Amino acid sequence: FIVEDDESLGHKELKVRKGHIAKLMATEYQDEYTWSSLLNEGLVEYIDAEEEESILIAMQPEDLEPAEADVDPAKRIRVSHHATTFTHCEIHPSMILGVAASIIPFPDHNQSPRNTYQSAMGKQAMGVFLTNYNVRMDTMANILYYPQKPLGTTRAMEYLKFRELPAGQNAIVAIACYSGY
Amino acid sequence: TLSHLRRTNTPIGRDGKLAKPRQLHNTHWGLVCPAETPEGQACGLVKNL
């Protein structure tokens, strides 16, 4: 998000507004206002790696902007809204993640390497790789009888086409020793 | 199937280039995935976008 202080009324802010948004969901509705427009409308840029070296980015769009008014005891603990030299802003952090990871529930709650494993086992599990297996003579492949879409999910899955082509089922899991098996 | 379509193989010197490469870099933020890489062998050498 290009965030220049182009705002007379105030300070620095996203070169995009709640209007731009509704103007988008507009097209979302009837499946007019493209992404490409969000580009040419000089609203957001394709920040190269090199180029990135010379900018400042606000993590959470909002949050890291206005002033002040006791935080929430339940939430985590995030750094402040330092400086205002901000040039751009992050769409959503969840985007540093690649396919695999994006399917991991609450990756921001596990021992760093754990999220790596899941990044490999999902690539080893079963599923419904496509809905035309009925007509594919691919040498070998497995489909889970009754796949269930997961209960807990990521906003990311939405685009990864998951609730539509899951890789497992939600089983009522009981954590506990028993027979000792 | 997706995860594979968006993957990256990065050549090496000859034997495990233990250092510079394989590590997760700063410049990696936002571009490459930080957690998804192969265990051992070509670890950190093959990346997922």
Binding site: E13, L14, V16, R17, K18, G19, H20, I21, A22, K23, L24, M25, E28, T34, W35, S36, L38, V44, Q60, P61, E62, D63, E65, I91, H92, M95, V99, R155, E158, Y159, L160 | L2, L5, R6, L49
Partner: peptide, 30 residues
């Protein structure tokens, strides 16, 4: 107020637009 700020929840809609156009294989294709 077709030009108010933008709460987090909104961005999703943006990213949606992204793939709407781009595609999870954007790279490979183009």
């Amino acid at each position: 107020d077709e030009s108010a700020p933008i709460t987090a929840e909104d961005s999703w809609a943006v990213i949606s637009a992204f793939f709407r156009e781009k595609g999870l294989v954007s790279q490979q294709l183009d």
